[PDB]
Design a binder for this molecule. Structure first.
Ligand SMILES: O=C(N[C@H]1C[C@@H]1c1ccccc1)[C@@H]1CN(C(=O)c2ccc(C(=O)N3C[C@@H](C(=O)N[C@H]4C[C@@H]4c4ccccc4)[C@H](C(=O)N[C@H]4C[C@@H]4c4ccccc4)C3)cc2)C[C@H]1C(=O)N[C@H]1C[C@@H]1c1ccccc1
Ligand SMILES: O=C(N[C@H]1C[C@@H]1c1ccccc1)[C@@H]1CN(C(=O)c2ccc(C(=O)N3C[C@@H](C(=O)N[C@H]4C[C@@H]4c4ccccc4)[C@H](C(=O)N[C@H]4C[C@@H]4c4ccccc4)C3)cc2)C[C@H]1C(=O)N[C@H]1C[C@@H]1c1ccccc1
Ligand SMILES: *[C@@H]1O[C@H](CO)[C@@H](O[C@@H]2O[C@H](CO)[C@@H](O)[C@H](O)[C@H]2NC(C)=O)[C@H](O)[C@H]1NC(C)=O
Ligand SMILES: *[C@@H]1O[C@H](CO)[C@@H](O[C@@H]2O[C@H](CO)[C@@H](O)[C@H](O)[C@H]2NC(C)=O)[C@H](O)[C@H]1NC(C)=O
Ligand SMILES: CC(=O)N[C@@H]1[C@@H](O)[C@H](O)[C@@H](CO)O[C@H]1O
Ligand SMILES: *[C@@H]1O[C@H](CO)[C@@H](O)[C@H](O)[C@H]1NC(C)=O
Ligand SMILES: *[C@@H]1O[C@H](CO)[C@@H](O)[C@H](O)[C@H]1NC(C)=O
Ligand SMILES: *[C@@H]1O[C@H](CO)[C@@H](O)[C@H](O)[C@H]1NC(C)=O
Ligand SMILES: *[C@@H]1O[C@H](CO)[C@@H](O)[C@H](O)[C@H]1NC(C)=O
Ligand SMILES: *[C@@H]1O[C@H](CO)[C@@H](O)[C@H](O)[C@H]1NC(C)=O
Lengths: 546, 545
């Protein structure tokens, strides 16, 4: 019915509640009545919850809340009324909430935030979420009256129809503004009011296929502009970039789950010259969709705009070519993440043409279609500054006796590559090596500089030799088939700080487990997790021998 | 060390041989002395083999051949002097060979065929090969004087410097002409002489990057060429339009093939201002794109495929077949995209509105396809698709129900890493291949199936024959079958071929009676020989009480 813990954290999980339970007291610290059938909130339901710090009523279907229902909740810090049936909000609900830090009103069918300012008394408010998908159609200038500083403001303006000018300009500082909006009609009229107050701007759900930029009635404080679930065409992209051109200090541009398509027979004619890269140094593209029946587009002229970009992530976005032309324009690129794409070694060699990627130090090709460890090593050889190489989750299966790798390489990730053994293919220059989640039985490579070895989720029968890994700081060797370890082994690793030994079938026979059980107790702070004995589920740490 | 036969077949087994044997026989019908160090040929080393029909001397060090050394060879049919050190050719060697059918002279460092016609008396010659990669630089008009009909003519003119006009116009019919030529300078001058005589033209090794078409005043558009093959040829996006112009001279061209060719850009070429002709089959194999290629855009050529019926683009780095192209492929009935990298999702872009209306056979073997369900759905809208080969793709598993083109009669799921089969396989099938997988059971109801290929699995029990009434073919070899249900084969009234070999058949007589008796009564049906597990003795060779 209503289950609490020893410290007043209460939750109503049954879902068969028709009203707020009776007999709530000053000992209730948190009240989670999510996903119940509560319909009414009277002035007496919560009068004795003077110590209530969090009140969650998500997805209940609350019709009405009496004016003074929250009169006693002066210590409430977290109020979630999202997804109920409140079509009319009263400023008297929030007047007593002097300690309120989080307020969520999303998903309630109000057309307006009322004719009286709701948040004038929330002097401590930090996170405000407001709006809905269907009926929220007006933003008024009074709506955000007494709010000067907010950490996060989320406005679901999905079907907003009108925006009263300067409604949002009253908020001086907003670290993160999230704006849902299916159409772009109101986009530029909201932008002028928040461009000077927002640090991280996020636009969600908007259809920008036919977006056109027009000069603004206006410097900007936005450092990051995120587009999520947004639709863009090759034509409207140049308009979007003109909007980004108004943000002189923009550092980071991010497209998550967006859609890119052609308008049909569009060409780059005069937009090419009038585009300034600005100070954008990080580009992040995730899960870019291209319509199933797409119209072809050619945005190769945009390759030349990347000369100053330092950090690029293009994840899970159907990349099977990175042309040499593009890679040669990427003169400042230090970090490239191409995870979850369709790159094959053959075309990766074109990407590494002469004078390609001079500054690149980190290359991530996790979960592409890479097949040969050798060809990959030779492909990356001409990238002289490459130090971090992640080629995990590629079905390599095996490695030859000897390989070529970039000379400065110090981090190599061979996780989830389906290998059954390791060879000298792995260079001695490595400081960090990950060979987790494979099918290794042995690891006996001489890596005199290796600081960190990750080798969990294998079939290791014996610990690697400590003489071969002198400088080891970290050894993650959990989830193997280790039964014992040579006595005195860990004193050999003078620099050892963290070690994972759990999920191994440790033999806890006293004439053998003595050293390990003792070492664990003296070094409990080094062990991550706790090694258990095979038969009994008792920690090896708490095993003493005569 | 010469192993000879009573039928006259002799061999030069040992490789360290210095000369042709002395005192030969009238009973020699063949002579293979390949990979020897023979250097000389006198008239007395082979004056007795008047019944000789073949003579092979490849990879020898023959420097000279005395005049009339072949005087006795009046019935010789096969002469191979390939890869020797002959730099001077005499017409008296081929004077006596009135019955010669095959003559190979490739690989010899002669600069020309000589001032005397060499093939004037070879009235029955069918296959002639001549030239080499280093020194052959001239073709005189008399080179091919007395040759009227030939089945194959291979000319390795890699370093051809000069070509006398009309040298090859004398030959009236050549079914297959193979021409090696590094340069294209003499390409057009040789084409006009052969276009009326050649049926299958093959051009090898030529660099056509800067080839420009210039029409000769022949006006003999009446060409005999039906197939034009380019092998190991380098073409650019610019010169490709010039090659098309050359192909335009061949009004009757049916087949165009590029094997191991290279396509690249010249840097900044744009297609703005073509007749497909009769070309109905296009073949592209192992097309290479240079490591540091120059980008090219030949999408304008998509519109030239509207009359092609057969297309093979194998192992040519295909990620995409855009909807525009597949909409233009109106006549295409057969598409082989084996050994490519077709992104599974935009396989669905290829099957857009009005795509591939005539396509009956689609081969996507050995791409990177991952989902059987997504593949079948992608192909559903291709109404005329009857043959689908998606073998050698790592599907791993299949769901309970799938959607496939309603007319599908042939499905190839070989080498697909499946451990079981479900009703995803549609009942319309007549041919199913699920070979080289990890199946333990096959019990689908396929009332129309006539051929089941299911070898290289782990079948412990025969597929339920009651569910395959129309089976003509059952290849169930290389499995784990130990026994068979009694009378199973009686129900298969239309059975014609069956593979049972390489199974651990338990030859315990109180158990194996039916199978051993059936195989004896139906010997002509078994392909291979079923062997007993214990002993390697045939199953049909054991009779039970
Ligand atoms: O816009 C682009 N990139 C920018 C956005 C990127 C970005 C920039 C900066 C920062 C961040 C990101 C891409 C750039 N850009 C081109 O340059 C381009 C231009 C024309 C053609 C074309 O039209 N071509 C016919 C090809 C051709 O010539 N075909 C005929 C020869 C064949 C034929 C015809 C008839 C019968 C038989 C055969 C041509 C081609 O493929 N050329 C070879 C050079 C290239 C290649 C292929 C394979 C491997 C290596 C090289 C190129 C193809 C590509 C296409 C764009 C593109 O990819 N558009 C999307 C629609 C594409 C897509 C769809 C689905 C999945 C994934 C992507
Ligand atoms: O944009 C790109 N990469 C940048 C984003 C990456 C990045 C990395 C790091 C930092 C910053 C950015 C990639 C670049 N790029 C292209 O250039 C390109 C696009 C399309 C085609 C095309 O049109 N082709 C028809 C094919 C073809 O012609 N097929 C027909 C010939 C065959 C056929 C089949 C059946 C019957 C008859 C004919 C062509 C192909 O696949 N293979 C051709 C080479 C071979 C061939 C064979 C035979 C004859 C001729 C040619 C290739 C060719 C090339 C595709 C993009 C790509 O791979 N994915 C893009 C969608 C991704 C994206 C976009 C925007 C933002 C983020 C991600
Ligand atoms: C929400 O509830 C309040 C509470 O009654 C409504 O308040 C009335 O608003 C009208 C405006 O036309 C005033 O004339 C009344 O005096 C108000 N009454 C009270 C008690 O405040 C308010 O109208 C409701 N909102 C909507 C949209 O109906
Ligand atoms: C199913 O597909 C496989 C290929 O995955 C076919 O097997 C090949 O058959 C051809 C005969 O045309 C041989 O030349 C190849 O050597 C075979 N390759 C392999 C890997 O076996 C098979 O024939 C198809 N099944 C049919 C057509 O019934
Ligand atoms: C272990 C694995 O398969 N994948 C992990 C992933 O879960 C994690 O988010 C990421 C960053 O730490 O590192 C990798
Ligand atoms: C708030 O915005 C003003 C506008 O200039 C800026 O000076 C100030 O640093 C910002 N404060 C925070 C905490 O971001
Ligand atoms: C490598 O990085 C350094 C920066 O430390 C830079 O100066 C140099 O140009 C880069 N290129 C090579 C080849 O080292
Ligand atoms: C190696 O890559 C995996 C993902 O495949 C990741 O989870 C792991 O943290 C990486 N190893 C490192 C960073 O040492
Ligand atoms: C080739 O041989 C014949 C006869 O041995 C001779 O007459 C002719 O001059 C020779 N040619 C050369 C170039 O030696
Ligand atoms: C299939 O092929 C037939 C030719 O027999 C053609 O008439 C029809 O339009 C094609 N497409 C279909 C049936 O969808």
């Amino acid at each position: 019915s209503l289950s609490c813990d020893r410290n007043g954290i209460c939750k109503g999980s049954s879902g068969s509640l028709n009203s707020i339970p009776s007999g709530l007291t000053e000992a209730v610290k948190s009240l989670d009545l999510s996903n119940n059938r509560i319909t009414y909130i009277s002035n007496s339901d919560l009068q004795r919850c003077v110590n209530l710090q969090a009140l969650v009523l998500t997805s209940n279907g609350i019709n009405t809340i009496e004016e003074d229902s929250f009169s006693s909740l002066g210590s409430l810090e977290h109020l979630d009324l999202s997804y109920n049936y409140l079509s009319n909000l009263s400023s008297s609900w929030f007047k007593p909430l002097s300690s309120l830090t989080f307020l969520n009103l999303l998903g309630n069918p109000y057309k307006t935030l009322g004719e009286t300012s709701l948040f004038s008394h929330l002097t401590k408010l930090q996170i405000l979420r407001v709006g809905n998908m269907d009926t929220f159609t007006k933003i008024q200038r009074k709506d955000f009256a007494g709010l000067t500083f907010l950490e996060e403001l989320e406005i679901d303006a999905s079907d907003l129809q009108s925006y009263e000018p300067k409604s949002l300009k009253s908020i001086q500082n907003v670290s993160h503004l999230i704006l849902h909006m299916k159409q772009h009609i109101l986009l530029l009229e909201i932008f002028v009011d928040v461009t000077s107050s927002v640090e991280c701007l996020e636009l969600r759900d908007t259809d920008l296929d036919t977006f056109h930029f027009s000069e603004l009635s206006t410097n900007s404080l936005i450092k990051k502009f995120t587009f999520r679930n947004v639709k863009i065409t090759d034509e409207s992209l140049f308009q979007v970039m003109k909007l980004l051109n108004q943000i002189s200090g923009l550092l980071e541009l991010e497209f998550d789950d967006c859609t890119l398509n052609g308008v049909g027979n569009f060409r780059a004619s005069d937009n090419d010259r009038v585009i300034d890269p600005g100070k954008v140094e990080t580009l992040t593209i995730r899960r870019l969709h291209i319509p199933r029946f797409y119209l072809f587009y050619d945005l190769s002229t945009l390759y030349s705009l990347t000369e100053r970009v330092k950090r690029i992530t293009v994840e899970n976005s159907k990349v099977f070519l990175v042309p040499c032309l593009l890679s040669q324009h990427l003169k400042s690129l230090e970090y490239l993440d191409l995870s979850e794409n369709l790159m094959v070694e053959e075309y990766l060699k074109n990407s590494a043409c002469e004078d390609a990627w001079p500054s690149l130090q980190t290359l991530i090709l996790r979960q592409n279609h890479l097949a040969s460890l050798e060809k990959t090593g030779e492909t990356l050889l001409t990238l002289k500054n490459l130090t971090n190489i992640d080629i995990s989750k590629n079905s390599f299966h095996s490695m030859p006796e000897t390989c070529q790798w970039p000379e400065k390489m110090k981090y190599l990730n061979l996780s989830s590559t389906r290998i059954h053994s390791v060879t000298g293919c792995i260079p001695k220059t490595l400081e960090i090596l990950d060979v987790s989640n494979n099918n290794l039985n042995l690891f006996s490579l001489n890596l005199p500089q290796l600081k960190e070895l990750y080798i969990s989720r294998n079939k290791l029968m014996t610990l690697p030799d400590a003489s071969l890994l002198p400088m080891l700081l970290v050894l993650k060797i959990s989830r193997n088939q280790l039964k014992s370890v040579p006595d005195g082994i860990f004193d050999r690793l003078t620099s050892l700080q963290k070690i994972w030994l759990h999920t191994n079938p440790w033999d806890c026979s006293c004439p053998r487990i003595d050293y390990l059980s003792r070492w664990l107790n003296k070094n409990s702070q080094k062990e991550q997790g706790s090694a258990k004995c095979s038969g009994s589920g008792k920690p090896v740490r708490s095993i003493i021998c005569p």
